[PDB]
């Protein structure tokens with residue numbers, strides 16, 4: 001233990017993981033050189049995420065401009081979070097998600113049908129599939145944009161190191177503002193003539209007198225669109241990667257496609273698309289007996305918690321057959337901010353992997369030109385994943 005910050009960056013995962021392990025052991029609550037605090041143990045990550053009074057999700061809590069963006073449900077605390085969550089959950093329903101299955105399968109099947117035997121999984125499927133699905137769910141037209149989220153890439157590639165930096169707020173707003181404005185216009189068109197698409201549902205939604213204005217509906221639809229440009233794109237790459245490291249599971253899921261949901265849960269634990277979540281202390285508190293001051297940022301390492309042997313047995317072992325006494329998925333968060341889109345992600349990744357197996361039996365990652373381009377910061381995964389099918393319906397005698 002020395003007072004010289006490293007943090008292996010995300011790009012070297014094995015080194016990140018060895019660091020996390022040692023911190024879990026020796027420094028479970030750590031303050032970095034920017035005065036940002038880090039929480040590494042499973043039970044402590046849980047404490048933090050649950051306790052919204054002490055640990056607020058409003059980053060703008062500190063900054064002199066009390067600007068909580070309306071309808072940014074992940075950046076809003078009780079009691080307003082509660083009423084907001086109720087309004088959106090009433091538009092964004094299981095039924096609404098589940099009816100998507102046939103379209104999810106149609107799109108996935110057509111995109112793969114054209115891929116050849118050697119392609120980029122991200123450009124071919126992992127990116128265009130959720131973009132298409134989420135737009136259609138929201139009731140938007142098909143978009144012209146596609147470079148693996150030109151704007152969503154800019155977002156995750158933000159000029160950032162010190163999260164205390166006030167500029168950062170502006171750099172984010174710079175990217176999102178054009179997109180939020182475009183959605184605000186779409187919401188106003190649906191307010192005029194509502195359909196059954198999700199934007200119409202959002203605009204008509206009302207729970208205990210609380211309705212979304214076009215500000216809030218546009219903001220929240222923007223978040224949803226962003227979720228669809230990034231999350232499945234990262235998870236599905238992580239799934240193929242991991243299965244490529246334990247390839248016996250390709251054959252097992254081919255024989256019993258009902259094993260697929262469990263593969264997805266396991267990769268979620270093993271490689272969470274989002275390894276860290278962020279909170280701000282609203283008051284002097286302590287974690288693990290470590291005193292933390294008011295008004296500072298706190299990062300909760302979901303990646304650490306997931307590899308913490310006190311939470312799981314043999315935690316670095318990739319094992320889909322691991323029954324869990326109360327399978328609750330920390331990679332989708334913990335508490336009242338628990339992932340609203342969890343069913344949709346589970347559905348898209350299940351259908352995706354099903355369709356990969358049905359056409360190809362298996363894919364392997366292709367490192368025959370370069371090593372993978374990992375995300376350097378926000379998410380845990382790769383920007384591209386060139387793959388190779390050994391088998392496919394194209395092969396002839």
Ligand code: HEM
Pocket residue numbers: 057073074075085134223224225227228231232235272273274277278330331332333334336337338339340341342344345
């Ligand atoms: C692999 C896929 C996904 C992962 C790992 C994931 C992860 C997460 C996590 C960790 C949180 C909690 C954030 C916090 O506590 O600060 C969260 C919240 C949220 N996610 Fe996701 N998500 C995924 C897919 C999606 C999708 C597809 C959508 C919507 C289309 C979505 C929408 C949301 C929303 C709206 C919330 C916040 C709910 C609230 O604040 O009450 N997610 N997600």
Ligand SMILES: CC(=O)N1CCN(c2ccc(OC[C@@H]3CO[C@@](Cn4ccnc4)(c4ccc(Cl)cc4Cl)O3)cc2)CC1
Pocket residue numbers: 072073074160161162163223224226227231274276277278299339341377378
């Ligand atoms: C030092 C350093 O690099 N820090 C690392 C960790 N920091 C960080 C960590 C996590 C993070 O994710 C925040 C939030 C939490 O989850 C999401 C990502 N997301 C999207 C759908 N499901 C999850 C999100 C949830 C809900 C909604 Cl409506 C929109 C979004 Cl988008 O971003 C954003 C930034 C960034 C700075």
